[PDB]
Amino acid sequence: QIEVGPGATNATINFEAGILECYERFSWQRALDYPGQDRLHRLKRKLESRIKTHNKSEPENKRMSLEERKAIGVKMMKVLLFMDPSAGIEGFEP
Amino acid sequence: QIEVGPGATNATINFEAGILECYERFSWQRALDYPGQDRLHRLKRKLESRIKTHNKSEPENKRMSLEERKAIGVKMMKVLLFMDPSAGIEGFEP
Amino acid sequence: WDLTVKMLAGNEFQVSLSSSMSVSELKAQITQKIGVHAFQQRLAVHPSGVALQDRVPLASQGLGPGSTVLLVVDKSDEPLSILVRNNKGRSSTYEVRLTQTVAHLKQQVSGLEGVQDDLFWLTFEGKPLEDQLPLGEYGLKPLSTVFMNLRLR
Amino acid sequence: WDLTVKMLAGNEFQVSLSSSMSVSELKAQITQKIGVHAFQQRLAVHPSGVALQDRVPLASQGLGPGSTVLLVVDKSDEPLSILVRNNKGRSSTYEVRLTQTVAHLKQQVSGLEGVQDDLFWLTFEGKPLEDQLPLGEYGLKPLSTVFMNLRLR
């Protein structure tokens, strides 16, 4: 149970967009099982609505689409996997 | 709907162990929101039982713990994020 | 030769090769076996992890009978716009995907230009595009310019 | 100085520094502000991405008032075994975590060796360990050997 502030909301949306990207890339290898493919499709549907909802609270210039957020998400995951800011500097800038 | 064979079962278990690792590392940054933390805890619980179940079908020497599988999973994700076998050669060897 | 192709799940398959075979032929066989376009294949030698070299004979880069290569498939396929410049020098813009075949693009250009598709062929950086190959085989980039060439009769 | 610390979610906070402050002092302030051990902090300069250099003055690596550093926290904390060798040269094995304080280890060694914890101190690679600091501050590795030193009275 970790105390977090607002905008862990935004960050988690972005992070999980990156997660979706990984699932999608994994699926290209024919390695994602059928339950897994179901998890992927559901993530994408929950994500798209969550993004919809969330973009309504955001200021016009910072309402990003799923496609835009996957890019931030991938950056974040590179940082995490190497535990190195250098791996995705833009990850810190959402 | 992608046709996959058996052992997409094993691979998806390993992949999602890596996914869990990412969630856990993301949580260390205080960036994972409360619903997200709930998703993490549930993944870990489903994963541990899935691993349990799955290890019963596997031959003795290849029944790996969650900790061991997170390592393979992280390797896989490095390969996917850079779309480069070099990023985690051991990822191909589960 | 017979070569082992190992994918991310650890699954393997075999592909039949020869001493005079290039990376291009290798990728062709892989497309035969699994239906993935050559330009979407990312290959490296197992277990060194060295990327395969397009210009270099397989045998000249530490492959032989029994060898194993690692494959990752990159199916990223977002739309891009490219240009096709007609015989008169007018360029028109086309939204395409790299998985789309050259024949597919020609149908688009044919409609726009009013020229039957058997009456022209396309070139990019000098080389002619083959109908049955995907655009990605040719390394088209955003706003690349392809040339329409009219077949004289 | 006042320095900006940017974390992965994009959230920022400020830390108060000075011209004679080292990376160690910087990390100390960060621990003050957010409760993360210095050894678990991974820092780089924004936006160059350059890692901070432990031996080098902050001012000598392109930081000053108003600067921003990026922080990633690494809380990986799996158990490892280390050795503590007593005054008689007997080594004993201890399972520890790098987040555990030196005082914590001393309690373990105290119980095993039968020596009150105020009657010895520990050293690693020559330097004395401070009670209140985590083991990870000292870069202990699996099977590292710490030395028990007896306080003479």
Coordinates of N, CA and C in Angstrom, one line a residue, chain D residues 4-145:
Chain D
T4 N 16.2 21.0 -8.3 CA 15.0 20.3 -8.6 C 15.2 18.8 -8.9
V5 N 14.4 17.9 -8.2 CA 14.5 16.5 -8.4 C 13.2 16.0 -9.1
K6 N 13.4 15.4 -10.3 CA 12.3 15.0 -11.1 C 12.2 13.4 -11.1
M7 N 11.0 12.9 -10.8 CA 10.9 11.5 -10.8 C 10.1 11.0 -12.0
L8 N 9.9 9.7 -12.1 CA 9.4 9.0 -13.3 C 8.0 9.5 -13.7
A9 N 7.1 9.7 -12.7 CA 5.8 10.2 -12.9 C 5.8 11.7 -13.4
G10 N 6.9 12.3 -13.4 CA 7.0 13.7 -13.8 C 6.9 14.7 -12.6
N11 N 6.5 14.1 -11.4 CA 6.5 14.9 -10.2 C 7.9 15.4 -9.8
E12 N 7.9 16.6 -9.2 CA 9.2 17.2 -8.8 C 9.1 17.7 -7.4
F13 N 10.3 17.8 -6.7 CA 10.5 18.4 -5.4 C 11.8 19.1 -5.4
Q14 N 12.0 19.9 -4.4 CA 13.2 20.7 -4.3 C 14.1 20.2 -3.1
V15 N 15.4 20.4 -3.3 CA 16.3 20.1 -2.3 C 17.3 21.2 -2.1
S16 N 17.7 21.5 -0.9 CA 18.6 22.7 -0.6 C 20.0 22.2 -0.6
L17 N 20.9 22.8 -1.4 CA 22.3 22.4 -1.5 C 23.3 23.6 -1.4
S18 N 24.5 23.3 -1.6 CA 25.6 24.3 -1.6 C 26.8 24.0 -2.5
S19 N 27.6 24.9 -2.7 CA 28.8 24.9 -3.6 C 29.8 23.8 -3.2
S20 N 29.8 23.5 -1.9 CA 30.8 22.5 -1.4 C 30.1 21.2 -1.2
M21 N 28.9 21.0 -1.7 CA 28.1 19.8 -1.5 C 28.5 18.8 -2.6
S22 N 28.6 17.5 -2.1 CA 28.9 16.4 -3.0 C 27.6 15.6 -3.3
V23 N 27.8 14.6 -4.2 CA 26.7 13.8 -4.5 C 26.1 13.2 -3.3
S24 N 27.0 12.8 -2.3 CA 26.6 12.1 -1.1 C 25.6 13.0 -0.3
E25 N 26.0 14.3 -0.2 CA 25.1 15.2 0.5 C 23.8 15.4 -0.2
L26 N 23.8 15.5 -1.6 CA 22.6 15.5 -2.4 C 21.7 14.3 -2.1
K27 N 22.3 13.1 -2.1 CA 21.5 11.9 -1.8 C 20.9 11.9 -0.4
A28 N 21.7 12.4 0.5 CA 21.2 12.6 1.9 C 20.0 13.4 2.0
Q29 N 20.0 14.6 1.3 CA 18.8 15.5 1.3 C 17.6 14.8 0.7
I30 N 17.8 14.0 -0.3 CA 16.8 13.3 -1.0 C 16.2 12.3 0.0
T31 N 17.0 11.6 0.8 CA 16.5 10.7 1.8 C 15.7 11.4 2.8
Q32 N 16.2 12.6 3.3 CA 15.5 13.5 4.2 C 14.1 13.7 3.6
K33 N 14.0 14.1 2.4 CA 12.7 14.5 1.8 C 11.8 13.4 1.4
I34 N 12.3 12.3 1.0 CA 11.4 11.2 0.6 C 11.5 9.8 1.2
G35 N 12.5 9.7 2.1 CA 12.7 8.4 2.8 C 13.2 7.3 2.0
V36 N 14.0 7.5 1.0 CA 14.7 6.5 0.2 C 16.2 6.5 0.5
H37 N 16.7 5.3 0.8 CA 18.1 5.2 1.1 C 19.0 5.7 0.0
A38 N 20.1 6.3 0.3 CA 21.0 6.8 -0.7 C 21.4 5.7 -1.7
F39 N 21.8 4.5 -1.2 CA 22.2 3.5 -2.2 C 21.1 3.0 -3.1
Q40 N 19.9 3.3 -2.9 CA 18.8 2.9 -3.8 C 18.5 4.0 -4.8
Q41 N 19.1 5.2 -4.7 CA 18.9 6.3 -5.6 C 19.7 6.2 -6.9
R42 N 19.1 6.3 -8.1 CA 19.8 6.4 -9.3 C 19.5 7.7 -9.9
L43 N 20.6 8.6 -10.0 CA 20.4 10.0 -10.4 C 21.2 10.3 -11.7
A44 N 20.6 11.2 -12.5 CA 21.2 11.7 -13.7 C 20.9 13.2 -13.9
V45 N 21.7 13.9 -14.6 CA 21.4 15.3 -14.9 C 20.3 15.5 -15.9
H46 N 19.4 16.4 -15.7 CA 18.4 16.7 -16.7 C 18.8 18.0 -17.5
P47 N 18.6 17.9 -18.8 CA 18.1 16.7 -19.4 C 19.2 16.0 -20.2
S48 N 20.4 16.2 -19.9 CA 21.5 15.5 -20.6 C 21.4 14.0 -20.4
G49 N 21.0 13.6 -19.2 CA 20.9 12.2 -18.9 C 22.2 11.6 -18.3
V50 N 23.2 12.4 -18.2 CA 24.5 12.0 -17.6 C 24.3 11.6 -16.1
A51 N 24.9 10.5 -15.8 CA 24.9 10.0 -14.4 C 25.7 10.9 -13.5
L52 N 25.3 11.1 -12.3 CA 26.1 11.9 -11.3 C 27.4 11.1 -10.9
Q53 N 28.5 11.9 -10.7 CA 29.8 11.3 -10.4 C 30.1 11.5 -8.9
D54 N 30.1 10.4 -8.2 CA 30.3 10.3 -6.7 C 31.5 11.1 -6.2
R55 N 32.6 11.1 -6.9 CA 33.9 11.7 -6.4 C 34.0 13.1 -6.8
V56 N 33.1 13.6 -7.7 CA 33.2 14.9 -8.3 C 32.2 15.9 -7.7
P57 N 32.7 17.1 -7.3 CA 31.8 18.2 -6.8 C 30.7 18.4 -7.8
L58 N 29.5 18.6 -7.2 CA 28.3 18.9 -8.0 C 28.6 20.0 -9.0
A59 N 29.3 21.1 -8.6 CA 29.5 22.2 -9.4 C 30.5 21.9 -10.6
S60 N 31.2 20.8 -10.4 CA 32.2 20.4 -11.5 C 31.5 19.5 -12.5
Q61 N 30.3 19.2 -12.3 CA 29.6 18.4 -13.3 C 28.3 19.0 -13.9
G62 N 28.3 20.3 -14.0 CA 27.2 21.0 -14.7 C 25.9 21.1 -13.9
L63 N 26.0 21.2 -12.6 CA 24.9 21.5 -11.8 C 25.1 22.8 -11.1
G64 N 24.0 23.5 -10.8 CA 24.1 24.8 -10.1 C 22.7 25.1 -9.5
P65 N 22.5 26.3 -9.0 CA 21.2 26.7 -8.6 C 20.2 26.6 -9.7
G66 N 19.0 26.0 -9.5 CA 18.0 25.9 -10.5 C 18.1 24.7 -11.3
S67 N 19.2 24.0 -11.3 CA 19.4 22.7 -12.0 C 18.3 21.7 -11.7
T68 N 18.1 20.7 -12.6 CA 17.2 19.6 -12.3 C 18.0 18.2 -12.5
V69 N 17.8 17.3 -11.5 CA 18.3 16.0 -11.7 C 17.1 15.0 -11.8
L70 N 17.3 13.9 -12.5 CA 16.3 12.8 -12.6 C 16.7 11.7 -11.6
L71 N 15.6 11.2 -11.0 CA 15.8 10.2 -10.0 C 15.0 9.0 -10.3
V72 N 15.6 7.8 -10.3 CA 14.9 6.5 -10.3 C 15.3 5.8 -9.0
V73 N 14.3 5.2 -8.4 CA 14.5 4.5 -7.1 C 14.6 3.0 -7.4
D74 N 15.6 2.3 -6.9 CA 15.8 0.9 -7.0 C 15.7 0.2 -5.7
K75 N 14.5 -0.4 -5.4 CA 14.2 -1.0 -4.1 C 14.4 -2.5 -4.1
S76 N 15.1 -3.0 -5.1 CA 15.4 -4.4 -5.1 C 16.1 -4.8 -3.8
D77 N 15.6 -5.8 -3.1 CA 16.2 -6.0 -1.8 C 16.1 -7.5 -1.4
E78 N 16.5 -8.4 -2.3 CA 16.5 -9.8 -2.0 C 17.6 -10.1 -1.0
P79 N 17.4 -11.2 -0.2 CA 18.4 -11.6 0.8 C 19.7 -12.0 0.2
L80 N 20.8 -11.8 0.9 CA 22.1 -12.3 0.5 C 22.8 -12.8 1.8
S81 N 23.7 -13.7 1.6 CA 24.5 -14.2 2.7 C 25.8 -13.4 2.7
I82 N 26.3 -12.9 3.9 CA 27.6 -12.4 4.0 C 28.3 -13.1 5.1
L83 N 29.6 -12.8 5.3 CA 30.4 -13.4 6.4 C 30.9 -12.3 7.3
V84 N 30.9 -12.6 8.6 CA 31.5 -11.8 9.6 C 32.6 -12.6 10.3
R85 N 33.8 -12.2 10.3 CA 34.9 -12.9 10.8 C 35.3 -12.3 12.2
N86 N 35.3 -13.2 13.2 CA 35.5 -12.7 14.5 C 37.0 -12.5 14.8
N87 N 37.3 -12.0 16.0 CA 38.7 -11.7 16.4 C 39.6 -13.0 16.4
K88 N 39.0 -14.2 16.5 CA 39.7 -15.4 16.5 C 39.9 -15.9 15.0
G89 N 39.3 -15.2 14.1 CA 39.4 -15.6 12.7 C 38.4 -16.6 12.2
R90 N 37.5 -17.0 13.1 CA 36.3 -17.8 12.6 C 35.3 -16.9 11.9
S91 N 35.0 -17.3 10.7 CA 33.9 -16.6 9.9 C 32.6 -17.3 10.1
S92 N 31.5 -16.5 10.3 CA 30.2 -17.1 10.4 C 29.3 -16.4 9.3
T93 N 28.3 -17.2 8.8 CA 27.5 -16.7 7.7 C 26.2 -16.1 8.3
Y94 N 25.8 -15.0 7.6 CA 24.6 -14.2 8.0 C 23.8 -13.9 6.8
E95 N 22.5 -14.2 6.9 CA 21.6 -13.8 5.8 C 21.1 -12.4 6.2
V96 N 21.3 -11.5 5.3 CA 21.0 -10.1 5.5 C 20.3 -9.5 4.3
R97 N 19.7 -8.3 4.4 CA 19.3 -7.5 3.3 C 20.0 -6.2 3.3
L98 N 20.3 -5.6 2.1 CA 21.1 -4.4 2.1 C 20.3 -3.2 2.8
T99 N 19.0 -3.3 2.9 CA 18.3 -2.2 3.6 C 18.4 -2.2 5.1
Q100 N 18.9 -3.3 5.6 CA 19.1 -3.5 7.1 C 20.2 -2.6 7.5
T101 N 20.1 -2.0 8.7 CA 21.1 -1.1 9.2 C 22.2 -1.9 9.8
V102 N 23.4 -1.3 9.8 CA 24.5 -1.8 10.5 C 24.2 -2.3 11.9
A103 N 23.4 -1.4 12.6 CA 23.1 -1.8 14.0 C 22.4 -3.1 14.0
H104 N 21.5 -3.4 13.0 CA 20.8 -4.6 12.9 C 21.7 -5.8 12.8
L105 N 22.7 -5.7 11.9 CA 23.7 -6.8 11.7 C 24.5 -7.0 13.0
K106 N 24.9 -5.9 13.7 CA 25.6 -6.0 14.9 C 24.8 -6.8 15.9
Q107 N 23.5 -6.6 16.0 CA 22.7 -7.4 16.9 C 22.8 -8.9 16.6
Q108 N 22.8 -9.2 15.3 CA 22.9 -10.6 14.9 C 24.3 -11.2 15.3
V109 N 25.4 -10.4 15.0 CA 26.7 -10.9 15.3 C 26.9 -11.0 16.8
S110 N 26.3 -10.0 17.5 CA 26.4 -10.0 19.0 C 25.8 -11.3 19.6
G111 N 24.6 -11.7 19.1 CA 24.0 -12.9 19.6 C 24.9 -14.1 19.3
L112 N 25.3 -14.3 18.1 CA 26.1 -15.4 17.6 C 27.4 -15.5 18.4
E113 N 28.1 -14.4 18.5 CA 29.5 -14.4 19.1 C 29.5 -14.3 20.6
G114 N 28.4 -13.9 21.3 CA 28.4 -13.7 22.7 C 29.2 -12.5 23.2
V115 N 29.1 -11.4 22.4 CA 29.8 -10.2 22.8 C 28.8 -9.0 22.7
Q116 N 28.7 -8.3 23.8 CA 27.8 -7.1 23.8 C 28.1 -6.2 22.6
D117 N 27.0 -5.7 22.0 CA 27.2 -4.9 20.7 C 27.9 -3.6 20.9
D118 N 28.0 -3.1 22.2 CA 28.8 -1.9 22.4 C 30.3 -2.2 22.6
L119 N 30.6 -3.5 22.6 CA 32.0 -3.9 22.8 C 32.7 -4.2 21.5
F120 N 32.1 -4.0 20.3 CA 32.8 -4.2 19.1 C 32.2 -3.2 18.0
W121 N 33.0 -3.1 16.9 CA 32.4 -2.4 15.7 C 32.8 -3.2 14.5
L122 N 32.2 -3.0 13.4 CA 32.4 -3.8 12.2 C 33.2 -2.9 11.2
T123 N 34.1 -3.6 10.4 CA 34.7 -2.9 9.3 C 34.6 -3.7 8.0
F124 N 34.6 -3.0 6.9 CA 34.5 -3.7 5.6 C 35.5 -3.0 4.6
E125 N 36.3 -3.7 3.9 CA 37.4 -3.1 3.1 C 38.0 -2.0 3.9
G126 N 38.3 -2.3 5.2 CA 39.1 -1.3 6.0 C 38.3 -0.2 6.7
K127 N 37.2 0.3 6.1 CA 36.4 1.3 6.7 C 35.3 0.8 7.7
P128 N 35.2 1.5 8.8 CA 34.2 1.2 9.9 C 32.8 1.5 9.4
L129 N 31.8 0.6 9.8 CA 30.5 0.7 9.5 C 29.7 1.6 10.5
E130 N 28.9 2.5 10.1 CA 28.1 3.3 11.0 C 26.8 2.7 11.3
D131 N 26.5 2.6 12.6 CA 25.3 1.9 13.1 C 24.0 2.2 12.4
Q132 N 23.8 3.5 12.1 CA 22.5 4.0 11.6 C 22.3 3.8 10.1
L133 N 23.4 3.5 9.4 CA 23.4 3.4 7.9 C 23.0 2.0 7.5
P134 N 22.3 1.9 6.3 CA 22.0 0.5 5.8 C 23.3 -0.1 5.3
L135 N 23.2 -1.5 5.2 CA 24.4 -2.2 4.7 C 24.7 -1.8 3.3
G136 N 23.7 -1.5 2.5 CA 23.8 -1.2 1.1 C 24.7 0.1 0.8
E137 N 24.8 0.9 1.8 CA 25.6 2.1 1.7 C 27.1 1.7 1.5
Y138 N 27.4 0.5 2.0 CA 28.8 0.1 2.0 C 29.1 -0.9 0.8
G139 N 28.1 -1.1 0.0 CA 28.3 -1.9 -1.2 C 28.7 -3.3 -0.9
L140 N 28.1 -3.9 0.1 CA 28.3 -5.3 0.4 C 27.8 -6.1 -0.7
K141 N 28.5 -7.2 -1.0 CA 28.1 -8.1 -2.1 C 27.9 -9.5 -1.5
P142 N 27.3 -10.4 -2.2 CA 27.2 -11.8 -1.7 C 28.5 -12.4 -1.3
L143 N 28.6 -12.9 0.0 CA 29.8 -13.5 0.5 C 30.9 -12.5 0.8
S144 N 30.6 -11.2 0.8 CA 31.6 -10.3 1.3 C 31.9 -10.6 2.8
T145 N 33.1 -10.2 3.2 CA 33.5 -10.5 4.6 C 33.7 -9.2 5.3

